[PDB]
PDB file of C-alpha atoms in Angstrom:
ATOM      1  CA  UNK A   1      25.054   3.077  13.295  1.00  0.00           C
ATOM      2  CA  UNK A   2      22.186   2.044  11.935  1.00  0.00           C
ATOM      3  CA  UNK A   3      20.100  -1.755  10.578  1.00  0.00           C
ATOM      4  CA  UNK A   4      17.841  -1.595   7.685  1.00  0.00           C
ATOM      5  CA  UNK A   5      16.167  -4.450   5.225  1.00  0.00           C
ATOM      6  CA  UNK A   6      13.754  -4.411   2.921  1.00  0.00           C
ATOM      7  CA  UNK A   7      11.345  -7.561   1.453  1.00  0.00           C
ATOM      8  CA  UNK A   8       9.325  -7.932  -1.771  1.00  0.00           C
ATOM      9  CA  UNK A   9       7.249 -11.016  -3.253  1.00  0.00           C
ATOM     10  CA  UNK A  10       4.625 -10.800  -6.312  1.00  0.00           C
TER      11      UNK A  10
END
């Protein structure tokens, strides 16, 4: 298995 995020502000 495996966890994975991602995050994006201007």
């Amino acid at each position: 298995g495996y966890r994975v995020t991602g995050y994006e502000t201007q």
